[PDB]
């Protein structure tokens, strides 16, 4: 075949019930999420090939960046309770990667202040258990999937992207190859 199991995408032996349509993982800490996000722009061209009615999540993962990392997660927890992702992903990328600006949660905060979010109103998500919830459910997510590496991609709790086996000569190239990867997925 064109797509082989193992070779574009693996398949979890231990299938996850109710899991979300397009599910990805990520770390402010980890270097190649960080090519993904604003080299390559995954998440932006796998949803442009979606089709209709499907629904795209992105979540956090703890075990990078220690006590930082999880303080992380939190914020992204805080990001998805605003709607406010699309503002603090980038800042918060190149605080932790590039400018190294961000060591505490006090700096994570400064990223949300500086993106117009009002103070009151991020210590106020952040605090509130509406966001102790999306935690969980970041948690849980990585959890139903034994996740230890990041970036990850997994479809319909069944099907996992394997991006080693394609192409990387081309950046957009394998952009494509992916996000086609993902629809092919989907249909499945």
């Given at each position: 075949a064109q797509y082989e199991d193992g070779?574009?995408?693996?398949?979890?032996?231990?299938?996850?019930?109710?899991?979300?349509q397009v599910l990805e993982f990520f770390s402010f800490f980890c270097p190649h999420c960080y090519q993904f996000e604003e080299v390559l722009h995954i998440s932006d061209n796998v949803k442009k090939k979606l089709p209709e009615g499907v629904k795209m999540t992105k979540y956090h993962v703890?075990?990078?960046?220690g006590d930082l990392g999880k303080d992380l997660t939190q914020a992204w927890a805080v990001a998805m309770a605003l709607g406010?992702?699309?503002?603090?992903?980038?800042?918060?990328?190149?605080?932790v990667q590039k400018?190294?600006?961000?060591?505490?949660?006090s700096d994570i905060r400064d990223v949300f202040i500086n993106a117009g979010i009002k103070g009151e109103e991020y210590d106020a998500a952040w605090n509130s258990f509406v966001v102790k919830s999306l935690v969980a459910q970041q948690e849980?997510?990585?959890?139903?999937?034994?996740?230890?590496?990041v970036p990850a991609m997994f479809?319909?709790?069944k099907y996992q992207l394997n991006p080693q086996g394609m192409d990387t000569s081309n950046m957009d190239?394998?952009?494509?190859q992916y996000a086609d990867?993902?629809?092919?997925?989907?249909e499945k």
């Open positions: 070779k574009q995408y693996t398949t979890l032996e231990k299938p996850v019930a109710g899991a979300p703890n075990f990078m960046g406010v992702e699309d503002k603090v992903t980038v800042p918060l990328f190149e605080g400018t190294q600006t961000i060591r505490s949660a849980k997510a990585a959890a139903d999937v034994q996740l230890r590496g479809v319909n709790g190239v394998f952009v494509q990867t993902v629809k092919y997925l989907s």
